Amino acid sequence: TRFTEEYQLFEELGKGAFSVVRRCVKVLAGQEYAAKIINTKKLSARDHQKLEREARICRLLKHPNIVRLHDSISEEGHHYLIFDLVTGGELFEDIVAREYYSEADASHCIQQILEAVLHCHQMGVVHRNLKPENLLLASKLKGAAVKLADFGLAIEVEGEQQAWFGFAGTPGYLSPEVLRKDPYGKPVDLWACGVILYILLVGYPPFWDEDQHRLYKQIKAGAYDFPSPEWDTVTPEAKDLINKMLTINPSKRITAAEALKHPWISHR
């Protein structure tokens, strides 16, 4: 079947629970891709549902700031999710290297992220796991576009209907409603956007603790601040957008659509 006869495998790009991500070449086309290779030998019925869900969600999303799924190939004992190759690496690595982004660069960055999240939300997809590791740069040329990646934890929602969809995400980026084990939906992504925007502007996260129990307490109480000296030169309107994203009550939290109309984004 198609992958084994048409594609050649090269170096590893990442790891998963029962998957690797490897660079591959479609040999006759001379085009390179990133292949998520899932070992499907004795997968549970639910694990088969989640693989199909990831494939369906990735096929659904067509956006300049979302990684394109090229193909979904089922072979004996192996499934291949074939994505466009993205060579700029994690947004995470670029923030660490540059320490922080200027407000102009941070605004441009979060604008692209919010456009990607807006599209997801319009198509009834909640990512649930937004973070700098899951945002890739299109090239190594500075000012390259950001691409939302890894919909392995993504869920399908029916309009604005919210529910307990289970405990999933990354500690530092988890919304209060997920940590309380309360019903949630699209707003969990805007909370994560708030954490990412905070990181962009000063190069460290708003919530952090060696003790995970204290981390979760600080998140649930929205106990973040803007310490000196890094926040001393940051505009009030940057702090305002962060505040509206890092709103504990998900009803009153800014939406993707609203965030894109905020003066700090739109007047620029």
Binding site: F167, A168, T170, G203, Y204
Partner: peptide, 14 residues
């Protein structure tokens, strides 16, 4: 003091 660190994803509670 808060640090930018790579963190692992969960699909159930710790």
């Amino acid at each position: 003091r808060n640090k930018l660190r790579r963190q692992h994803s969960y699909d159930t509670f710790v």
